[PDB]
Write an enzyme that holds these catalytic residues in place. Structure first.
Site, PDB file in Angstrom:
ATOM      1  CB  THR B 126      20.589 -17.722  40.252  1.00 48.13           C
ATOM      2  OG1 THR B 126      21.657 -18.240  41.034  1.00 48.13           O
ATOM      3  CG2 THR B 126      19.313 -17.723  41.064  1.00 48.13           C
ATOM      4  CE1 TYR B 149      19.989 -13.595  44.018  1.00 46.60           C
ATOM      5  CE2 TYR B 149      21.211 -15.618  44.368  1.00 46.60           C
ATOM      6  CZ  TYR B 149      20.858 -14.557  43.540  1.00 46.60           C
ATOM      7  OH  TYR B 149      21.321 -14.445  42.260  1.00 46.60           O
TER       8      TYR B 149
HETATM    9  N1  NAD Z   1      27.272 -13.101  39.261  1.00 43.57           N
HETATM   10  C1  NAD Z   1      26.947 -14.393  39.285  1.00 43.57           C
HETATM   11  O1  NAD Z   1      27.747 -15.277  39.597  1.00 43.57           O
HETATM   12  C2  NAD Z   1      25.541 -14.800  38.915  1.00 43.57           C
HETATM   13  C3  NAD Z   1      25.202 -16.154  38.806  1.00 43.57           C
HETATM   14  C4  NAD Z   1      23.859 -16.513  38.677  1.00 43.57           C
HETATM   15  C5  NAD Z   1      22.956 -15.557  38.267  1.00 43.57           C
HETATM   16  N2  NAD Z   1      23.257 -14.225  38.332  1.00 43.57           N
HETATM   17  C6  NAD Z   1      22.219 -13.214  38.002  1.00 43.57           C
HETATM   18  O2  NAD Z   1      22.747 -12.363  36.991  1.00 43.57           O
HETATM   19  C7  NAD Z   1      22.187 -11.058  37.093  1.00 43.57           C
HETATM   20  C8  NAD Z   1      23.318 -10.055  37.084  1.00 43.57           C
HETATM   21  O3  NAD Z   1      24.167 -10.350  38.218  1.00 43.57           O
HETATM   22  P1  NAD Z   1      25.452  -9.431  38.506  1.00 43.57           P
HETATM   23  O4  NAD Z   1      26.472 -10.246  39.233  1.00 43.57           O
HETATM   24  O5  NAD Z   1      25.885  -8.805  37.247  1.00 43.57           O
HETATM   25  O6  NAD Z   1      24.874  -8.375  39.582  1.00 43.57           O
HETATM   26  P2  NAD Z   1      25.136  -6.806  39.739  1.00 43.57           P
HETATM   27  O7  NAD Z   1      24.673  -6.391  41.076  1.00 43.57           O
HETATM   28  O8  NAD Z   1      26.503  -6.478  39.256  1.00 43.57           O
HETATM   29  O9  NAD Z   1      24.152  -6.244  38.589  1.00 43.57           O
HETATM   30  C9  NAD Z   1      22.686  -6.120  38.708  1.00 43.57           C
HETATM   31  C10 NAD Z   1      22.311  -4.678  38.499  1.00 43.57           C
HETATM   32  O10 NAD Z   1      20.873  -4.532  38.642  1.00 43.57           O
HETATM   33  C11 NAD Z   1      20.647  -3.208  39.026  1.00 43.57           C
HETATM   34  N3  NAD Z   1      19.296  -3.132  39.566  1.00 43.57           N
HETATM   35  C12 NAD Z   1      18.820  -3.788  40.653  1.00 43.57           C
HETATM   36  N4  NAD Z   1      17.585  -3.465  40.949  1.00 43.57           N
HETATM   37  C13 NAD Z   1      17.214  -2.547  39.986  1.00 43.57           C
HETATM   38  C14 NAD Z   1      16.026  -1.823  39.761  1.00 43.57           C
HETATM   39  N5  NAD Z   1      14.940  -1.833  40.547  1.00 43.57           N
HETATM   40  N6  NAD Z   1      16.036  -0.983  38.700  1.00 43.57           N
HETATM   41  C15 NAD Z   1      17.134  -0.893  37.939  1.00 43.57           C
HETATM   42  N7  NAD Z   1      18.311  -1.483  38.093  1.00 43.57           N
HETATM   43  C16 NAD Z   1      18.270  -2.337  39.123  1.00 43.57           C
HETATM   44  C17 NAD Z   1      21.739  -2.890  40.043  1.00 43.57           C
HETATM   45  O11 NAD Z   1      22.015  -1.505  40.154  1.00 43.57           O
HETATM   46  C18 NAD Z   1      22.937  -3.691  39.499  1.00 43.57           C
HETATM   47  O12 NAD Z   1      23.905  -2.874  38.847  1.00 43.57           O
HETATM   48  C19 NAD Z   1      21.294 -11.082  38.344  1.00 43.57           C
HETATM   49  O13 NAD Z   1      19.932 -11.285  37.995  1.00 43.57           O
HETATM   50  C20 NAD Z   1      21.795 -12.287  39.143  1.00 43.57           C
HETATM   51  O14 NAD Z   1      20.771 -12.834  39.964  1.00 43.57           O
HETATM   52  C21 NAD Z   1      24.543 -13.850  38.697  1.00 43.57           C
HETATM   53  O1  UGA Z   2      25.616 -19.397  40.893  1.00 41.63           O
HETATM   54  C1  UGA Z   2      24.834 -18.678  41.404  1.00 41.63           C
HETATM   55  O2  UGA Z   2      23.679 -18.828  41.181  1.00 41.63           O
HETATM   56  C2  UGA Z   2      25.291 -17.549  42.327  1.00 41.63           C
HETATM   57  O3  UGA Z   2      26.701 -17.447  42.149  1.00 41.63           O
HETATM   58  C3  UGA Z   2      27.313 -16.490  43.009  1.00 41.63           C
HETATM   59  O4  UGA Z   2      27.076 -16.853  44.324  1.00 41.63           O
HETATM   60  P1  UGA Z   2      28.097 -17.801  45.149  1.00 41.63           P
HETATM   61  O5  UGA Z   2      27.938 -19.163  44.589  1.00 41.63           O
HETATM   62  O6  UGA Z   2      27.896 -17.455  46.577  1.00 41.63           O
HETATM   63  O7  UGA Z   2      29.501 -17.236  44.615  1.00 41.63           O
HETATM   64  P2  UGA Z   2      30.783 -16.634  45.370  1.00 41.63           P
HETATM   65  O8  UGA Z   2      30.394 -15.397  46.111  1.00 41.63           O
HETATM   66  O9  UGA Z   2      31.878 -16.592  44.363  1.00 41.63           O
HETATM   67  O10 UGA Z   2      31.023 -17.793  46.465  1.00 41.63           O
HETATM   68  C4  UGA Z   2      31.495 -19.080  46.018  1.00 41.63           C
HETATM   69  C5  UGA Z   2      31.952 -19.879  47.218  1.00 41.63           C
HETATM   70  O11 UGA Z   2      33.054 -19.184  47.862  1.00 41.63           O
HETATM   71  C6  UGA Z   2      32.827 -19.122  49.251  1.00 41.63           C
HETATM   72  N1  UGA Z   2      33.437 -17.877  49.717  1.00 41.63           N
HETATM   73  C7  UGA Z   2      32.963 -16.648  49.314  1.00 41.63           C
HETATM   74  C8  UGA Z   2      33.524 -15.490  49.705  1.00 41.63           C
HETATM   75  C9  UGA Z   2      34.694 -15.510  50.537  1.00 41.63           C
HETATM   76  O12 UGA Z   2      35.305 -14.516  50.933  1.00 41.63           O
HETATM   77  N2  UGA Z   2      35.131 -16.777  50.884  1.00 41.63           N
HETATM   78  C10 UGA Z   2      34.582 -17.980  50.492  1.00 41.63           C
HETATM   79  O13 UGA Z   2      35.030 -19.064  50.851  1.00 41.63           O
HETATM   80  C11 UGA Z   2      31.315 -19.211  49.457  1.00 41.63           C
HETATM   81  O14 UGA Z   2      31.041 -19.747  50.744  1.00 41.63           O
HETATM   82  C12 UGA Z   2      30.900 -20.138  48.309  1.00 41.63           C
HETATM   83  O15 UGA Z   2      30.909 -21.521  48.659  1.00 41.63           O
HETATM   84  C13 UGA Z   2      26.770 -15.069  42.837  1.00 41.63           C
HETATM   85  O16 UGA Z   2      27.263 -14.224  43.884  1.00 41.63           O
HETATM   86  C14 UGA Z   2      25.226 -15.084  42.865  1.00 41.63           C
HETATM   87  O17 UGA Z   2      24.696 -13.817  42.430  1.00 41.63           O
HETATM   88  C15 UGA Z   2      24.667 -16.189  41.979  1.00 41.63           C
HETATM   89  O18 UGA Z   2      23.250 -16.246  42.146  1.00 41.63           O
END
Ligand code: NAD
Ligand code: UGA
Ligand code: NAD
Ligand code: UGA
Lengths: 314, 314
Positions: B126, B149
């Protein structure tokens, strides 16, 4: 002030408590759960004197179970040394206690320190965060740990930065380099090798013995550590290397031990253990500048001190 | 070839599985414990579309309660996405699940992969590891996470490096930048603001709304993730940023959303929340070189797709 020392019954913590108690204006609270590689018998020996001092309070509890409200009440300074510290024993099922005691403990302490007015939170970390690096390492260098242990200690440092930046906890990080001397933990090379040599048993060498460390004598380590409290200059947010007078290989150390004992060591050369760098070497310029730190104990003097301590122990 | 995807029922995992199943060469195993911020109702639908395909096998188990030896015998590639992902909910008593599912899960998977013959262990990390930086961040920049986190995710990266160096596990680390589109988790900004805008409710903004993200459309994220498997270049040991076509602040996104809905939003500016950077911005030089990565989905097209999905979901 009142100073909390976590891991107060351990190798370094026991010495740090003793040093702080030489200043009549300091009161020390020591907390230690008696876990990790040192048997509880040795830990009782480390604190027996401390417990006679009226300005020392000893708490034998797990930081993760203790009332941290009660513990941090009217505390001015935290020295956080509590950890599970072995480089070589952090694999497979042995990892969980590193995560619990190095990561969860640090986080729970930092959470507790949000609602109180510390002067400093002095977080003790390790040269193990650097991993395998060439030359003298400076505190601005990208850390790439080689051991799961090193990973958990670096996570502790990052938690320090998170809580400093968000909640203004006044953190200072010290990175120690292989500390030795009296009360050294029994899993560390000098304790093991001295105990082996005393018993006329083979000296256990991991790899070929040409690996080197920046060995730091305990009294040098403690002088650096106390200087981090006693400075009036702003070192909040700083990472500071605390290193030793003289680097050496394990072969060099063994030769020095043979000169102290007048014995000749039988050597057993084991496989290199995964997770260990071949060299450590501190750049201690920053400690020199910020803390007026200069290590003064030579390996010949420090090793005689430890040899005497180990002989009397057993 | 046979591909294990952890967190398969999640936002990014379910889209990843969907993309791999388009290739009739690929057999996919998904494992998901249905935990974290997304209620299990929405994840059920994720595994339901995947389970239409005969080349998908779903395991509903905690990775910490799974016979990982048995599971990994016939696996060629692991995509490790399972984690607890929320930036804002990692404080105090909420921290432990992040350590368990981000640190102990990663360690235990890597331990099980020690004696498997993998092509690749593709570890999803991330932009949260970097913390606050000026300019587009490159992967060799010293990371200083702002959130607990972020600390737990950077600890997972460090475990990948440890197991790569010591045991030759063929790790690749992908650092994603705030991913959005259809199936986006309900705790993310675009999901909440679109839901809010749809229901004529105040849009909740955490601070002044000047915060910006290198927002990555889900299809762009997935093309870079699949490229990490299929690339002609050797990427073993590399950290690779996966970032988006266009950076925006929350105010900009709110203006782009008004254009799509044809509504004027009521704004509700709330206190900024600890542990969040003001800017994220990926240098995607490395992904361009090693993966032929170029993000192609514009914010207007991507927000429209997410708008249509949220509209349909409620
Ligand atoms: N969504 C974003 O913007 C973003 C950005 C940066 C990185 N990531 C990374 O991408 C990955 C996926 O993120 P996401 O948004 O799809 O999250 P998400 O919560 O939708 O998916 C992650 C899944 O992992 C499963 N999980 C957690 N712990 C587990 C365990 N012990 N055993 C089995 N399953 C388990 C959960 O049930 C969940 O469905 C994560 O590693 C997150 O840190 C996400
Ligand atoms: O890039 C990443 O690494 C991370 O990106 C997202 O995290 P975040 O950047 O917090 O993404 P959003 O939840 O979309 O928030 C983006 C921005 O919107 C703001 N925000 C969020 C929620 C809301 O209701 N209002 C609002 O202004 C937050 O303060 C933040 O600055 C994902 O939630 C994380 O799992 C991931 O690790
Ligand atoms: N000894 C060295 O060479 C060296 C070098 C670099 C850094 N360090 C660091 O210095 C510190 C002290 O190391 P040491 O050699 O004195 O180790 P030690 O094992 O002798 O002392 C640490 C003490 O922490 C206590 N402790 C651990 N978890 C606890 C918990 N949950 N609650 C309460 N007490 C707990 C243990 O009981 C132990 O007595 C550690 O943080 C270590 O990582 C040591
Ligand atoms: O500086 C540090 O940060 C670390 O220093 C020491 O870790 P280590 O360097 O492993 O210290 P020793 O256990 O004294 O090992 C020194 C060297 O001796 C070797 N060794 C150790 C023990 C032994 O029996 N034989 C042997 O050859 C090791 O391979 C290593 O190269 C402490 O044990 C750690 O708690 C601390 O984090």
């Amino acid at each position: 002030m009142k100073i909390l020392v976590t891991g107060a019954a351990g190798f370094i913590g026991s010495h740090l408590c003793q040093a702080l108690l030489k200043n009549s204006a300091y009161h020390v609270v020591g907390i230690d759960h008696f876990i990790g590689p040192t048997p509880a018998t040795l830990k009782t020996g480390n604190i027996q004197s401390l417990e006679l001092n009226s300005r020392f309070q000893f708490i034998r509890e797990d930081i993760l179970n203790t009332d941290l409200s009660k513990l941090l009440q009217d505390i001015d300074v935290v020295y956080h040394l509590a950890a599970i510290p072995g480089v070589r024993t952090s694999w497979g099922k042995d990892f969980q206690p590193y995560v619990t005691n190095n990561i969860m403990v640090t986080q729970q302490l930092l959470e507790a320190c949000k609602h109180i007015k510390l002067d400093k939170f002095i977080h003790i970390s390790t040269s193990s965060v650097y991993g395998e690096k060439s030359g003298a390492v400076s505190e601005d260098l990208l850390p790439i740990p080689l051991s799961p242990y090193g990973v958990t200690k670096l996570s502790g440092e990052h938690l320090c930065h998170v809580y400093h930046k968000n909640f203004h906890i006044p953190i200072v990080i010290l990175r120690y380099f292989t500390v030795y001397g009296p009360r050294q933990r029994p899993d560390m090379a000098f304790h093991r090798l001295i105990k082996q040599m005393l018993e006329d048993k083979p000296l256990t060498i991991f790899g070929d013995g040409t690996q080197t460390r920046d060995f730091t004598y305990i009294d040098d380590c403690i002088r650096g550590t106390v200087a981090a409290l006693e400075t009036k200059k702003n070192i909040i947010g700083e990472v500071i290397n605390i290193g030793g007078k003289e680097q050496a290989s394990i072969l060099d150390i063994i030769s020095m031990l043979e000169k102290i004992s007048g014995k000749s060591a039988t050597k057993n050369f084991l496989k290199s253990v995964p997770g260990e760098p071949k060299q450590t070497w501190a750049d201690i310029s920053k400690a020199s500048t910020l803390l007026q730190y200069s290590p003064t104990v030579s390996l010949s003097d420090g090793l005689e001190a430890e040899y005497d301590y180990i002989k009397q122990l057993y």
